[PDB]
Amino acid sequence: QVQLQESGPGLVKPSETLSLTCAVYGSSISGGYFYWHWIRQAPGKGLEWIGDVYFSGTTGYNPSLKRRVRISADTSKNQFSLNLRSVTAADTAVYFCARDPRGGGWVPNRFDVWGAGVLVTV
Amino acid sequence: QVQLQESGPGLVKPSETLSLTCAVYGSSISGGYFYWHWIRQAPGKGLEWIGDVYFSGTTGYNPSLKRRVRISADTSKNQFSLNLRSVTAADTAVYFCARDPRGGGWVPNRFDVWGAGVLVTV
Amino acid sequence: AVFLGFLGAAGSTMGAASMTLTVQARNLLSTVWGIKQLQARVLAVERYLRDQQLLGIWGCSGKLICCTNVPWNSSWSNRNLSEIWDNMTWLQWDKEISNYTQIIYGLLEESQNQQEKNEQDLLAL
Amino acid sequence: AVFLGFLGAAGSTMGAASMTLTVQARNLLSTVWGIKQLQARVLAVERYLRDQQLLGIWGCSGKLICCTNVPWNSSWSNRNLSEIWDNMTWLQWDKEISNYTQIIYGLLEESQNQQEKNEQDLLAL
Amino acid sequence: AVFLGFLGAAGSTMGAASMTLTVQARNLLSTVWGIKQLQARVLAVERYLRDQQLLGIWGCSGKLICCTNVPWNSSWSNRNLSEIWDNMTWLQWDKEISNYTQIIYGLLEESQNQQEKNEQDLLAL
Amino acid sequence: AENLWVTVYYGVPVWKDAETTLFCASDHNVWATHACVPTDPNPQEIHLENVTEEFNMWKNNMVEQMHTDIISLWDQSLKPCVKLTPLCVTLQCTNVTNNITDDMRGELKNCSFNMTTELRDKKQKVYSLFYRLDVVQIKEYRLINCNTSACTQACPKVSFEPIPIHYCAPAGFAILKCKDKKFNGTGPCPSVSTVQCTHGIKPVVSTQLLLNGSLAEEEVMIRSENITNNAKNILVQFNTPVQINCTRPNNNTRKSIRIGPGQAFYATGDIIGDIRQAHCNVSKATWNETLGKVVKQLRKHFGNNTIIRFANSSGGDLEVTTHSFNCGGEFFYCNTSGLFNSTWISNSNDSITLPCRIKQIINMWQRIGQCMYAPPIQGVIRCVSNITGLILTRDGGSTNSTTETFRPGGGDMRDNWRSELYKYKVVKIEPLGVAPTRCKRR
Amino acid sequence: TLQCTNVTNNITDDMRGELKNCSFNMTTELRDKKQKVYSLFYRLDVVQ
Amino acid sequence: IRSENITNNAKNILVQFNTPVQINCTRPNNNTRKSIRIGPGQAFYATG
Ligand SMILES: *[C@@H]1O[C@H](CO)[C@@H](O[C@@H]2O[C@H](CO)[C@@H](O[C@@H]3O[C@H](CO)[C@@H](O)[C@H](O[C@H]4O[C@H](CO)[C@@H](O)[C@H](O)[C@@H]4O)[C@@H]3O)[C@H](O)[C@H]2NC(C)=O)[C@H](O)[C@H]1NC(C)=O
Ligand SMILES: *[C@@H]1O[C@H](CO)[C@@H](O[C@@H]2O[C@H](CO)[C@@H](O)[C@H](O)[C@H]2NC(C)=O)[C@H](O)[C@H]1NC(C)=O
Ligand SMILES: *[C@@H]1O[C@H](CO)[C@@H](O[C@@H]2O[C@H](CO)[C@@H](O)[C@H](O)[C@H]2NC(C)=O)[C@H](O)[C@H]1NC(C)=O
Ligand SMILES: *[C@@H]1O[C@H](CO)[C@@H](O)[C@H](O)[C@H]1NC(C)=O
Ligand SMILES: *[C@@H]1O[C@H](CO)[C@@H](O)[C@H](O)[C@H]1NC(C)=O
Ligand SMILES: *[C@@H]1O[C@H](CO)[C@@H](O)[C@H](O)[C@H]1NC(C)=O
Ligand SMILES: *[C@@H]1O[C@H](CO)[C@@H](O)[C@H](O)[C@H]1NC(C)=O
Ligand SMILES: *[C@@H]1O[C@H](CO)[C@@H](O)[C@H](O)[C@H]1NC(C)=O
Ligand SMILES: *[C@@H]1O[C@H](CO)[C@@H](O)[C@H](O)[C@H]1NC(C)=O
Ligand SMILES: *[C@@H]1O[C@H](CO)[C@@H](O)[C@H](O)[C@H]1NC(C)=O
Ligand SMILES: *[C@@H]1O[C@H](CO)[C@@H](O)[C@H](O)[C@H]1NC(C)=O
Ligand SMILES: *[C@@H]1O[C@H](CO)[C@@H](O)[C@H](O)[C@H]1NC(C)=O
Ligand SMILES: *[C@@H]1O[C@H](CO)[C@@H](O)[C@H](O)[C@H]1NC(C)=O
Ligand SMILES: *[C@@H]1O[C@H](CO)[C@@H](O)[C@H](O)[C@H]1NC(C)=O
Numbered sequence A, B: 001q002v003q004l005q006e007s008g009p010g011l012v013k014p015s016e017t018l019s020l021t022c023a024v025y026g027s028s029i030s031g032g033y034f035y036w037h038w039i040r041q042a043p044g045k046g047l048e049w050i051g052d053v054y055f056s057g058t059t060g061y062n063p064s065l066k067r068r069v070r071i072s073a074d075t076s077k078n079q080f081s082l083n084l085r086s087v088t089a090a091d092t093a094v095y096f097c098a099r100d101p102r103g104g105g106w107v108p109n110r111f112d113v114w115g116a117g118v119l120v121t122v
Numbered sequence C, D, E: 001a002v003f004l005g006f007l008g009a010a011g012s013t014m015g016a017a018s019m020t021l022t023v024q025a026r027n028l029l030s031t032v033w034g035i036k037q038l039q040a041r042v043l044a045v046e047r048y049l050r051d052q053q054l055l056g057i058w059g060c061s062g063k064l065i066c067c068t069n070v071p072w073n074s075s076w077s078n079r080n081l082s083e084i085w086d087n088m089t090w091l092q093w094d095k096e097i098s099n100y101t102q103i104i105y106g107l108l109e110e111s112q113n114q115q116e117k118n119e120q121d122l123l124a125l
Numbered sequence F: 001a002e003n004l005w006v007t008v009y010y011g012v013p014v015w016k017d018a019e020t021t022l023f024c025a026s027d028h029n030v031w032a033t034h035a036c037v038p039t040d041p042n043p044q045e046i047h048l049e050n051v052t053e054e055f056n057m058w059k060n061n062m063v064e065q066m067h068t069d070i071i072s073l074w075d076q077s078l079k080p081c082v083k084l085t086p087l088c089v090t091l092q093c094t095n096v097t098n099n100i101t102d103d104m105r106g107e108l109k110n111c112s113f114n115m116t117t118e119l120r121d122k123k124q125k126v127y128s129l130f131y132r133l134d135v136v137q138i139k140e141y142r143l144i145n146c147n148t149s150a151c152t153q154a155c156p157k158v159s160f161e162p163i164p165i166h167y168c169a170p171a172g173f174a175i176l177k178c179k180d181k182k183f184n185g186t187g188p189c190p191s192v193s194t195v196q197c198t199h200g201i202k203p204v205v206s207t208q209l210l211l212n213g214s215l216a217e218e219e220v221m222i223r224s225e226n227i228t229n230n231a232k233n234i235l236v237q238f239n240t241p242v243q244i245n246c247t248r249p250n251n252n253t254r255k256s257i258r259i260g261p262g263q264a265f266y267a268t269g270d271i272i273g274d275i276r277q278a279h280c281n282v283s284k285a286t287w288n289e290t291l292g293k294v295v296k297q298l299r300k301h302f303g304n305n306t307i308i309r310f311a312n313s314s315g316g317d318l319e320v321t322t323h324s325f326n327c328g329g330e331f332f333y334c335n336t337s338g339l340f341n342s343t344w345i346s347n348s349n350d351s352i353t354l355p356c357r358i359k360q361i362i363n364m365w366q367r368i369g370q371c372m373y374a375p376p377i378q379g380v381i382r383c384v385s386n387i388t389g390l391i392l393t394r395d396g397g398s399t400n401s402t403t404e405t406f407r408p409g410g411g412d413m414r415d416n417w418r419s420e421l422y423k424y425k426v427v428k429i430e431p432l433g434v435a436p437t438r439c440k441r442r
Numbered sequence G: 001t002l003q004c005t006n007v008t009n010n011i012t013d014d015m016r017g018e019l020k021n022c023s024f025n026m027t028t029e030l031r032d033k034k035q036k037v038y039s040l041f042y043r044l045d046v047v048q
Numbered sequence H: 001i002r003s004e005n006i007t008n009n010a011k012n013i014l015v016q017f018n019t020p021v022q023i024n025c026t027r028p029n030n031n032t033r034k035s036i037r038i039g040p041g042q043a044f045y046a047t048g
């Protein structure tokens, strides 16, 4: 069984760093097979990709948030963290962390398993 | 306790190769930290550099005596030897062998420990 | 912390798995019970050294992705690149050409020897 | 006759000590007491082979002075060239960046992998 | 097998024997009775690793025929090329040039170090 | 003008004489095949042409290595066996009385003694037949080995039959053969051939009458370190078999006596039949022709007109005076005097029958403090071996006089191994080489 | 077990209460036999 | 004088001299060794 859990402050004062940590019990992050994305969903809106991180550190963020976000991934304890800097009043959303079998290119980007979904209100 | 001792013929017929062996008790020639020089001083005159030898064999002699001299250092028995060919009356002098801490860029040519000094009359 | 994803790309395609060779390449080296442990260490060392010697004989010393000038005979395999790097995995490829391996190694060896001889002849001038 | 000046340049500056790397490289390889000697030899061989594999993964195989293309981040050390190669020794330098070594190794590894991939892509054209 | 045609060219001239270096090269690696075979394997590994380390120090790593740039002093041998490659064998050559081997090894080592330093300062610009 | 520069070559075919440790290659017994490597089914032999190599059978480290290997193997094989410490007791013995033979008199003795049993607080009384050589007078007798050392019994399960052991070489080393026929061991050999592993080197142990081995291919060969000096031994290698039949015509019985908790002592019980001395039979015509070939080959090196005399063993220990060997676990000390009793000078169906003496307390190697106890073998023993060589020594002091006397000799077991490990030499490769060539790196 | 007595020949004052002439039975080469032997054992070695 | 902690008396103190003090010990008694067989091969050496 593979599943991810998100942890972090569910309520933070706007206008500073917001830290979330998604930890996966299942497929290892170190394995060069899966990309770890950080899809977000604001209330009354659709999904919104933020960024992804690979085992070798070739991360890529959304062009909209290429400056305000930083995704790190540590494999010793097998988790990955998202730091959203200078969060505004529009960042109140559910921050999902998803798995993509893009590595191992049998199939293109395809989010199959999703985390529980932690709602952060700022 | 570090010092140097010179050996060789103290009197030679002034037309042949003149051999003078300086052996150091203390530091090792093999170590690439010290250059081994062969300073000379004739009576009633000042000092006069002859040549130096490194552990790797990159020797350099005085331009005045670049043809008549050869310095060879053997690290198996930790000594070195000066061979001065075509000796003349001008070679009646005290032949000191000196240690230079130029190996390592801490200081420039800084002759600190000098041998006993053998007067090789000729 | 050197294990860190050993055989992680086993199920990946050849093209995708070729980008993580260093992960799998760095783990090849690391009374009677001491004898057995030391014998295992010596066996691992001998295997690694034979591997390195075989790589060096082909001129690929110190390279993880080294590609040579020996032509690929179609007799060994008829599948094209599109059906190899994007449609097949490394285990299937190894099982497919398992019986055409020694001749490829020999061809690489003589090709490297001929290349060295030609380089020597050219550089003599 | 091979020992013949092991270390020696320990007190020398980094620049001067870098000129005598060969002397410190030749000596890195060469009932229960036979086991003692055998285990010592096997441990030395394993350490040397691990060091050689680490050097090769960076593309510096068969080179004593091999310099790569990755940049020097200022956070690792703000000391300048005039004060590192002519005023500090190797032991002090190692003690200074003792805790910034693994990340440098990872950067070298990924840079060599990227260089090899780029060479393959360029040569394919 | 790897033993096929081992040596073989011992009686051949130096020029002819130089064309079959791979055959000899690939054959250099492969309770008390366990310590016999195990010690023999460790000894062979150590000898091969020392020889490879010497080759790498000379800059000919991963090369069977790698000719250097140090001049040949006529004192070692006054024989001309025609009278050595086409008229002498490797065993006789080794028996001839045995006293000057260590000096040539040192010359190769210092030449490789000087070349590395020259390349370093050239690449610095 | 020359502009020639140094070049380094790897994997060069250059070798130097060296000594290393060879290992097994075989294909339960005392010569343990469990700790011995399997052998390939297709051995590879690489013939080398236009190579002359200086061989010296008398400075081969491989023979000493094999001697140490054999001694260590025997010592290891004797470790998991019962120790006959309780056997050192006073034996009450009498002569064998049933169906006595004239030759077999002053021989095997019916001894009785008290020995321990499974229970410590008890003492059984047991009888057995002990050969004269085993016992010694203290009507009281004791084992000969009692005042030297307590020594262990040989386990019945393990067999002493020789098994070939191919001595390969480690990685980086090579074994050079010498197929050149008419080679006297020492000197240059022009026909050199590299071999991955040696041939069958069956570890048969004997004295003066070297059993199963590799026969010569051209004719009888004579080898000696210094034939001028009579101190050194002379090995004679035959080119044809001289097949010998050695037997013990005495149907014996084995009885197990419990000497401790699980330890069993195997003793000779009944001798049903008729007592008869074990005998060694050598063909008369075959021995005559073989010895004539030996005579011609020796005459080649000792002048065309000389008197040579083949006399019996000089003397010494029983091991170094009779043709000792093992056939089925019983060690026949067949005495060789009729074989070597003749004189040769310039110019049907009967076969000889040597006398043989069975012994159970054995000190095979020249060592004091260790023995064995060969258990008795049920039934009759017949091995029908192959005599394919001899070790002869010249009696010095004959001066320039035409008289010459070659007599059986040996004692040292290295000569037995040296006869099958003469063409092989061990060398170590030197793959690095340097030569001139028109080159410049850059 | 050892039957021991004090030495009495050429004994000095300092070497008193010291090495003792002990006699005892011991096994021999033949298992079914014993021999009475003697030895001089220092006091520190033996204990009553 | 060398010690791990000279202030603490628990640790020992090693004193290394610069010159040697010549000392000669001796056992003037002229003892004899006799070998008595306690078993097959094994022999015990005793004071005579
Ligand atoms: C020199 O070469 C000759 C050539 O034959 C060689 O003779 C061989 O001797 C061995 C000695 O053991 C013989 O092996 C025996 O053969 C008989 C008959 O086949 C067997 O019954 C024997 O069985 C024993 O082992 C069994 C367990 O495996 C026991 O259950 C049994 O009771 C016996 O103890 C045994 O295998 C061999 O037969 C002959 N060769 C021939 C062709 O008969 C001789 O040994 C060589 N060396 C010397 C020094 O002579
Ligand atoms: C798991 O592996 C299988 C094959 O082992 C993949 O199936 C392939 O899917 C692609 C889809 O683009 C097809 O083109 C291939 O033909 C399929 N392979 C075979 C052998 O038919 C599957 O996509 C992989 N799944 C994941 C999540 O990686
Ligand atoms: C011995 O080493 C010390 C430092 O390890 C050297 O001290 C340096 O000396 C130079 C020249 O005087 C100064 O520019 C440096 O600032 C000094 N550094 C330190 C840390 O003191 C000393 O010069 C060396 N001595 C010799 C003889 O080599
Ligand atoms: C190091 O050298 C550079 C060279 O320009 C200089 O700018 C800098 O101030 C120096 N720093 C120190 C600490 O000496
Ligand atoms: C790393 O080492 C440097 C060397 O002085 C030190 O200043 C720094 O605090 C160290 N950092 C950590 C995280 O240990
Ligand atoms: C090589 O040997 C000498 C000169 O070294 C000369 O007699 C001979 O002719 C030379 N060979 C050739 C082909 O000139
Ligand atoms: C057995 O026979 C021998 C023959 O010499 C004789 O000396 C010996 O006394 C006999 N045994 C007994 C117990 O008499
Ligand atoms: C040996 O003596 C015993 C009696 O101690 C007797 O029973 C046995 O038959 C005798 N055997 C022979 C061969 O004399
Ligand atoms: C065995 O014990 C009996 C008991 O009477 C004794 O007579 C006999 O001599 C013993 N056997 C020996 C000492 O060999
Ligand atoms: C052991 O006893 C036998 C028979 O008396 C004797 O020949 C031999 O010399 C003895 N061995 C020793 C070491 O005394
Ligand atoms: C003995 O020699 C004959 C001669 O051909 C041979 O057939 C037989 O196998 C040999 N037996 C051995 C070596 O045991
Ligand atoms: C062996 O033969 C060589 C020549 O091949 C000869 O010099 C030597 O004297 C011979 N030795 C004996 C013992 O025959
Ligand atoms: C053989 O012995 C004689 C004795 O006179 C001696 O001169 C000769 O040198 C010896 N042979 C060898 C090879 O040493
Ligand atoms: C030896 O005795 C046993 C005991 O019964 C018998 O089976 C066997 O046939 C006998 N041997 C011969 C050759 O008759």
Ligand SMILES: *[C@@H]1O[C@H](CO)[C@@H](O)[C@H](O)[C@H]1NC(C)=O
Binding pocket: F245, F246, F247, F279, F281, F351, F352, F353
């Ligand atoms: C040995 O020869 C004798 C007499 O010729 C004969 O009685 C006996 O049967 C022979 N034995 C063998 C094994 O040939």
Ligand SMILES: *[C@@H]1O[C@H](CO)[C@@H](O)[C@H](O)[C@H]1NC(C)=O
Binding pocket: F243, F244, F245, F281, F282, F283, F351, F384
């Ligand atoms: C040995 O016995 C075999 C068979 O019993 C026989 O063929 C051979 O001739 C005998 N050996 C002789 C008589 O030398």
Ligand SMILES: *[C@@H]1O[C@H](CO)[C@@H](O)[C@H](O)[C@H]1NC(C)=O
Binding pocket: F312, F313, F314, F315, F337
């Ligand atoms: C056999 O050898 C012994 C000892 O060397 C000797 O006493 C005897 O006389 C020899 N045999 C003959 C028939 O001379």
Ligand SMILES: *[C@@H]1O[C@H](CO)[C@@H](O)[C@H](O)[C@H]1NC(C)=O
Binding pocket: F313, F321, F335, F336, F337, F338, F355
């Ligand atoms: C061997 O037998 C002969 C003939 O009977 C005899 O003269 C010789 O003494 C015997 N050997 C020994 C060592 O007694």
Ligand SMILES: *[C@@H]1O[C@H](CO)[C@@H](O)[C@H](O)[C@H]1NC(C)=O
Binding pocket: G004, G005, G006, G016, G017, G018
């Ligand atoms: C031996 O002398 C000591 C000291 O006087 C004494 O205590 C001891 O009883 C003496 N031994 C005997 C057996 O009396």
Ligand SMILES: *[C@@H]1O[C@H](CO)[C@@H](O)[C@H](O)[C@H]1NC(C)=O
Binding pocket: G001, G002, G003, G023, G024, G025
């Ligand atoms: C030794 O045995 C004898 C025989 O009975 C006995 O009298 C003596 O006391 C024994 N020695 C001891 C117990 O020290």
Ligand SMILES: *[C@@H]1O[C@H](CO)[C@@H](O)[C@H](O)[C@H]1NC(C)=O
Binding pocket: H005, H007, H008
């Ligand atoms: C030595 O022992 C004293 C005991 O009071 C302790 O206070 C002191 O710390 C010790 N020395 C060191 C270096 O810890």
